Amino acid sequence: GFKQDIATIRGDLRTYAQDIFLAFLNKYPDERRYFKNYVGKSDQELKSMAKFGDHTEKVFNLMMEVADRATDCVPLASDANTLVQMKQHSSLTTGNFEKLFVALVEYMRASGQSFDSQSWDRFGKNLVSALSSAGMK
């Protein structure tokens, strides 16, 4: 279930983070614009960039923290706050996050691994509603 999925992801965090982030960018090419160093780069080119691996690691670490702190796939209001308040996120809206979770769930369903994709879909939706309540547009 959801709790095991957090363990699965954490066990090989860099591999899942990179795989899912690339699925995100490739499903939604417009989102690449927020990451100027990623512009004009193939998947394998991004893997050769120190910042790519570092960044996506940090993103998925925080996502897993927020997931672990959630109750019944509903994130804490304070975690949504951390996400709204981050300077790196100042220009974002909830649609950016919504698209990320659509790509994440699609990835999980396509994978050979036994993820609880329904729970991740609920988690994404509940995060989107929480970001909005924490002041994101």
Binding positions for heme b are 36, 38, 51, 55, 58, 88-89, 97
Q: How far apart are CA 83 and CA 134, in angstroms?
A: 9
The strand pairing partners of 42, in sequence order, are: none
Is position 130 an interface residue for a second copy (rule: CB under 8 A)? yes
Is position 34 an interface residue for ligand HEM (rule: CB under 6 A)? yes
Is position 80 an interface residue for a second copy (rule: CB under 8 A)? no
Length of the chain: 137
Surface-to-core class of residue 19, CB atoms within 10 Å of its CB (0-12 exposed, 13-18 middle, 19+ buried): middle
Radius of gyration of the chain (CA): 14
The strand pairing partners of 74, in sequence order, are: 71
In Å, how far are 48, 50, 86 from 100, measured between CA atoms? 23, 22, 17
Is position 96 an interface residue for ligand HEM (rule: CB under 6 A)? yes
Q: Which is nearer to ligand HEM, 35 or 112 (CB)?
A: 35
Is position 119 an interface residue for ligand HEM (rule: CB under 6 A)? no
Is position 113 an interface residue for ligand [N+] (rule: CB under 6 A)? yes
CB of residue 112 to ligand HEM, shortest distance in Å: 24
Backbone region of residue 43 per phi and psi (left: phi > 0; alpha: psi in -120 to 50; beta: other values): alpha
Q: Which is nearer to ligand [N+], 1 or 135 (CB)?
A: 1
The residues that touch ligand HEM, with contacts defined as CB under 6 A, are 31, 34-35, 51, 54-55, 58-59, 62-63, 83, 88-89, 92, 96-97, 100
- Contact positions toward a second copy, by CB under 8 A? 71-74, 77, 122, 126, 129-130
